[PDB]
Point group: D2
Chain length 256, copies 4
């Protein structure tokens, strides 16, 4: 339900959300997997509607601590959706070309067009996250970006983009296990890079940056949802539920 | 299977391929779906390898007569593939922006990067198909493009791109039936009036497809003629050809350079 | 002389600016040409500094009624500037690709990078100008865009873009002569577009739209300048003066730092 | 005018071109400057036709040894050209995003459109130059690229692009002065890199790559011109002459009006 939408009152505190919380689903993994299968099928039908109607633009932003489940959320929640109408835009270390323009330039280029659903795998929020945590620009610079982001998203929404932002929220010990497993798994070693450790040493700074970002930019037109993500089955189910409910609210119809 | 690969001998004749041929699968519809499901899961694992290895580029080109099943092929063959590694680039009627540059400009911009598999829903070949059939440029112009394409694809492959080109081959009457289907129903939005103009030109299109295939099917960028009158056979055959191709790359997960605290 | 900078008090009135005003220059065309040549030489040197320092981004927006002199301003004001560091981005009728995204998508793509000076030949302001005058989207939509533009420009400025916006202001009788000239000159007829006459019939609505846009979006970090433009020599001189002074105000420095055998 | 167009016979030899050659212009520095001014103004006027006609695409390639004068040529040759029709595309060290595609991806994106003149400040040729000299890919890789480039440029020309490729040819001792003068000038030190020295130490391997590239890719649809570039006034004059005449050969026309009538 909507106990996970962050209200636009600037009173948000990340400690009020428990990464192991599963209270929204009355059951465990096995029943959730079945309910996910039902939601996934509705998602597929709604996506085909979105694409066919060709009017709405849908933007899903995914942010998380490292190993917080971004890849799994993309892979599982959107399984079976027509590839012609869903696109993943990943944002990594900015290139020199990208740093030569404002930080929103490379992000604005990737926004979804009419009839399209786009997933931001990481996003412009990295410019008030990692950029803040590692002081890649002075605080006086990034402090102003919360306003930039609110106004950029307001413009997107005003012009027809439905915006969903999900913070996949895992605990510190959960990250330790996933990072270790990533080491203890030959098919996952490629995902692990030593830089992952340095980011972990800053666990508390990142959590502070995430709370500030979420408090500052969760709006009626661009809400943040905090997703307890220690349980993959719960994470996938809750994201699917919110996404499906949002898409249903658009009242999309096939053209005559 | 390889009897469906157009050899680079310039002696391709499209009549030597039956739109209803299914001789490559020993069974019927139901047995094929079982093998297709097996191939699909094979496809998924190979995509995750491709993405993880981050070395090869894979370009799948889809061409067919209208209603020849390209949209269905994309939706069925790549069901369940991780969206982060599979991308569809569709090419429609060129804009003024795209016509102000060479015809390959808009196509080159969309090629797959390392670790990525890209589906061309239509391709640069439209510039030696519809462009030729409707004489949108003089033959003196487009007849040169067979070489451009051979060389453009040669450069892509030399630099690491695996190229598969599939012609989904249906019969004319089969087309009529499917077109009539499009009018009857949730799909009416897909139907176009220009489609009829193209239908009367069925023969000029078949000739262009044979010419393009004869001219541009190469060792580094082969054409496969896919009997596509049967969707279950079409999907199975394309899946089989692709999976073999990905298997031939012998891809391996990379390697690393210890206890997390 | 910042008598032409529109202050950010939302009080701007277009009627208080006379297109024939030349009061800022004590002289006429011949003396202005000499002052322009002096300013142009400084501009060329400041541009080389901008490029060499590689930190600031400079955006010059040009808007005007049709035949209001934007092409002439570009040609004359930027005569002799190194092509490696200045670039014109012109905005015409949005394509379907561009209309499928928010109106700022196609504009953001063209903003200047570090060390570069970009001229917007027309700009995002068309989306509260022609779009407003001809109701290309409902008033409920475009009325919201003044805020979008204020915040878009604020973000650009916060992140290092110096923004100058020039409204080249000609009178209605002046536009009649210049349009009539474009018809009577074989070297300019191609510039004449039949839509221009429709736009002329709406002269008053465009003036209203320009007044609203300028009142709504002239801010400290992104000022509008109203340029009396009936006199080309005065227009070119005044734009050069404002541009040069702005660039001088940035106080740009060449970057910091053995024999060759 | 005729003697600087590398013939498409694959026997091109660089040592048969003198960086100090000025034999194409009858005069000295001052007489060339006057002719350069005359060519410059025709260039301005021809560009306005190109832009207005909106049919032809014009691509000017500039390659040179470091400090060989590519920046100066752009600054001088195109001084006074309307920015609305002339665009410079610079190519530096590829980003990871650009390396994830074939080396021609980032270059093809920048080709000129109809009515436009584009200057490639460095180009796709760097992928058989610095890439070859420093073995950024195995010779097995970059050896195939001469073919790629001939065919890429053939496609461009067939589809309406006029291609001019200029190698600005300076001597090893001449480069030494410009690099030195680059240090001895507070307004130019920013241009000097230490990598400039490591590339200078490889002068001969670079010269060999240029001869190979020029011999392999000079064709009748995409000619290379070797420009004696030790003297700036001659370099600027010669490049201007070749460019202007080529533009004259296009026989560009102002369009016909839309459709005598009166304005109210
Ligand atoms: N604006 C930014 N400034 C600096 N670093 C950034 C920015 N945006 C993204 N990054 C960083 O880019 C890094 C790598 O992203 P990339 O997708 O290229 O690699 P990856 O191995 O797939 O990582 P992941 O799956 O965690 O995104 C991340 O650590 C992220 O913090
Ligand atoms: N280079 C080209 N020049 C002219 N027409 C082209 C070109 N490329 C594709 N086309 C034509 O444009 C149409 C494809 O446009 P688009 O992708 O918008 O179609 P659609 O309505 O989605 O359906 P479909 O693509 O399946 O036919 C086809 O009729 C094709 O022949
Ligand atoms: N956002 C927009 N919405 C609608 N029309 C627009 C928009 N932006 C620009 N235009 C229109 O585009 C036209 C300019 O087109 P373009 O620049 O391609 O041609 P042009 O002949 O050079 O015209 P001009 O010299 O007046 O700019 C103008 O009529 C202008 O009103
Ligand atoms: N394909 C390529 N592979 C490797 N290096 C390349 C490639 N293309 C260009 N470069 C190199 O990029 C370097 C930097 O050029 P850049 O345009 O970024 O800036 P610059 O300092 O102004 O250089 P310059 O004035 O010498 O052109 C040059 O040394 C050039 O050789």
């Amino acid at each position: 339900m909507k106990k996970y939408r962050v209200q636009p009152d600037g009173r948000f505190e990340l400690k009020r959300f428990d990464p192991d919380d599963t209270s929204a689903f009355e059951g465990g993994k096995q029943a959730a997997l079945e309910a996910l299968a039902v939601l996934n099928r509705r998602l597929e039908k709604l996506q085909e509607l979105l694409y066919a109607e060709g009017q709405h633009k849908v933007l899903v932003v995914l942010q998380a601590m490292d190993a917080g489940g971004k890849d799994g959320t993309i892979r599982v929640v959107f399984d079976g959706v027509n590839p012609s109408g869903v696109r993943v835009a990943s944002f990594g270390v900015p290139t020199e070309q990208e740093l030569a323009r404002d930080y929103l330039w490379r992000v604005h280029q990737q926004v979804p067009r009419k009839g399209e659903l786009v997933i931001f795998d990481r996003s412009h929020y990295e410019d008030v996250l990692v950029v803040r945590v590692k002081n890649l620009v002075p605080q006086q610079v990034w402090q102003k970006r919360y306003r930039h982001i609110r106004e950029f998203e307001r413009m997107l929404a005003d012009e027809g983009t439905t915006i969903l932002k999900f913070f996949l929220h895992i605990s510190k010990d959960e990250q330790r296990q996933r990072l270790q497993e990533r080491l203890d798994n030959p098919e996952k070693r490629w995902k692990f890079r030593m830089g992952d450790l340095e980011d972990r040493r800053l666990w508390d700074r990142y959590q502070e940056a995430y709370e500030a970002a979420i408090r500052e930019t969760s709006t009626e037109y661009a809400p943040w949802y905090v997703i307890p993500a220690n349980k993959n089955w719960y994470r996938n189910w809750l994201v699917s539920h919110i996404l499906v409910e949002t898409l249903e609210g658009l009242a999309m119809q096939y053209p005559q």
